[PDB]
Design a protein around this ligand. Structure first.
Ligand SMILES: O=P(O)(O)OC[C@H]1O[C@H](OP(=O)(O)OP(=O)(O)O)[C@H](O)[C@@H]1O
Ligand SMILES: O=P(O)(O)OC[C@H]1O[C@H](OP(=O)(O)OP(=O)(O)O)[C@H](O)[C@@H]1O
Ligand SMILES: COc1ccc(C(=O)CC(=O)C(F)(F)F)cc1
Ligand SMILES: COc1ccc(C(=O)CC(=O)C(F)(F)F)cc1
Ligand SMILES: [Mg+2]
Ligand SMILES: [Mg+2]
Ligand SMILES: [Mg+2]
Ligand SMILES: [Mg+2]
Lengths: 346, 348
């Protein structure tokens, strides 16, 4: 294997041979690729159209270099709630808010997240502005999870060897195959998740990667472009369980949700998005609560897919009830306060 | 204009807006593009599939940073004989040999060239092995052209500001749109040329670049992969004249050339390729001479097209006779000797 062979195959629009993506990703993670090579590869793979097998190789090699959490500190039913970002739409931090509501509903949450890449405020930025400790290592993440029912893996802390790819990603700006990797490389490896994909074409690919794992996942793409379950129109959901994928069109109007407009979900800077978290957790009704409740239910539905005691619709109805109740009973607000407390208590 | 905007347009499979390729190239030439940006751009522009307008912006910006030759030192009717390289075939240096023969036939040649990127021996490497000085600046290329009838612009000498692009090219290894730029960027700007393209899909784009310039050019791709007119089979010629392009299949059998095989055109290291130049110019008959003659004729035809009007077949017959005579009179062998002599005079 070599760069000329691999890049030549991609620029020729051919799928890679098994092991080539892994070789490439290992060169990148070991600091052995020149920046030009990283970029050539990220771009060529994007334009060829990565397959699930290739992305699984990239994510899998990327995980082999991640700091793991300690043994037996992640419950087998932990859920993640996270997206690719890059939806260009600059919303309030839907995934982050859903994650808190889900945790407050009794579901263990280990969230992967990062600073904003192109928006004004990303999940980690908002959390930080809320006073949640984002900079914790493996041991303290595990303690957060055990003591608060929620943990945050700050991607730059857990994936230090990814620094070369991350710098190239930043230098080129254009979204690539690398943009898929964050959501696929949660260092705690939870088995469930609600995973948002901004890129209509690549969500099936992400589902394919989850399919090869023992996962229960909803890969979601709003039909308006959100890497979240949207309230402005239908969403496409790739349901992943038992090694297979069930693609479906999801309409929240079936659950009595009013259609929103994108600008009603718009956010601002970190302090502004932190303010929107406090509003929603405090009971404020309206389009943002609706989106949060919708996505939190999505996460609960994925969790339920693990110990599969329920069908699609009933699971949605119970997820929605649990997500609403976690807010209305103050449980989400209480859980955030406890999370901040835990962080201040070292 | 930004990288995110330009790269995002390309990854979306869209042709660029006018001026965007020029912005990227200026970033590249001024030292302002990061290696990662250069490579992303090269690759994205390649996989999207460049247009002549885009490659023309790239080349025009590149030319603007190049060292020019001093004024009124390049003849109105100079020709170039050069290809993209990258045919992966490792032949004897066909362009270099044809350039010598063309000049010996009385056509001023200002040749753009470079070392091997992928071959064992490039044009420049072989010229060096023959004792030709490849490292001259504008003033001396210009003198060489006046006194010998041929001059050689060593790409690295004339395009110093391309060093970031060139380092990226070497690092990534795979052909991109950058591989088209050398031939489109001769710093003497001859208005005619026989330009070889190893990439069948990009030959048309090179042709359209020359057409916008109103150059008289044959852009050629041997149907066997050669960035030269071939003797093993037919060639595709994009004929550039009066600002328009014609695609043609060309068959040398129609002039009485017999089908050669590729390994008959095989070369080796600089010294072996130098020995093959010497053999051809000494009059040795055979497969290498046939290909040198065919290619020299092609450039002579391109050169004749600098005016109007004539047509095709007679111009080829005349080109072929002219190229044959240049050798058999001893003129091509003598020209290389003068060229070598001129280089040796520099020291004084
Ligand atoms: O700047 P962007 O590329 O458009 O992405 C914005 C955020 O979305 C992703 O995380 P996450 O899904 O956790 O954030 P969320 O809470 O805002 O949904 C990503 O890690 C960013 O934090
Ligand atoms: O290493 P490669 O990518 O295969 O390219 C071989 C040669 O072709 C180009 O020049 P030119 O057409 O003058 O050389 P030639 O005399 O060998 O044809 C290039 O500048 C190299 O000298
Ligand atoms: C300083 O070194 C680093 C800087 C940034 C990052 C990331 O940004 C990780 C990331 O996106 C992931 F996809 F989630 F893993 C990692 C290391
Ligand atoms: C060290 O500085 C340099 C080294 C190499 C080169 C080239 O290689 C030029 C080239 O191909 C061109 F496209 F014809 F211009 C340029 C500058
Ligand atoms: Mg999100
Ligand atoms: Mg979002
Ligand atoms: Mg050549
Ligand atoms: Mg050649």
């Amino acid at each position: 294997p070599s760069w000329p062979q691999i890049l030549g195959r991609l620029t020729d629009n051919r799928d890679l041979a098994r092991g080539q993506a892994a070789w490439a990703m290992d060169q990148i993670m070991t600091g052995n690729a020149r920046p030009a090579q990283i970029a050539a590869f990220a771009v060529a793979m994007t334009m060829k159209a990565p397959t699930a097998d290739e992305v699984g190789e990239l994510a899998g090699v990327m995980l082999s270099h991640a700091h793991p959490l300690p043994a037996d500190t992640v419950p087998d039913d932990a859920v993640d709630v996270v997206g690719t970002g890059g939806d260009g739409v600059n919303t309030v931090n839907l995934s982050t808010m859903a994650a808190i509501v889900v945790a407050a509903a009794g579901v263990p949450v280990v969230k992967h997240g990062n600073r904003a890449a192109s928006s004004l405020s990303g999940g980690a930025d908002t959390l930080e502005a809320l006073g949640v400790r984002i900079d914790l290592g493996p041991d303290l993440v595990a303690r957060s999870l055990a003591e608060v029912g929620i943990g945050f893996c700050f991607a730059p802390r857990f994936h230090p060897s990814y620094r070369h790819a991350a710098a190239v990603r930043r230098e080129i700006g254009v979204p690539t195959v690398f943009n898929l990797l964050g959501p696929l490389t949660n260092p705690a490896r939870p088995r469930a998740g609600l995973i948002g994909c901004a890129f209509a074409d690549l969500a099936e690919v992400m589902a394919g990667v989850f399919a090869a794992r023992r996962s229960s996942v909803l890969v979601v793409h709003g039909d308006d472009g959100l890497d979240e379950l949207t309230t402005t129109t239908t969403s496409t959901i790739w349901r992943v369980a038992a090694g297979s994928v069930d693609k479906l069109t999801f309409d929240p109007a079936g659950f009595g949700f009013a259609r929103a407009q994108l600008d009603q979900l718009a956010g601002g800077d970190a302090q502004a998005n932190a303010a929107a978290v406090r509003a929603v957790l405090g009971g404020a009704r309206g389009p943002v609560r609706d989106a949060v409740v919708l996505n939190a239910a999505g996460a609960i539905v994925a969790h339920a897919g693990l110990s599969s005691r329920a069908e699609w619709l009933p699971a949605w109805e119970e997820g929605l009830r649990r997500a609403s109740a976690a807010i209305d009973t103050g449980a989400a607000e209480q859980l955030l306060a406890r999370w901040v407390r835990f962080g201040r208590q070292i």
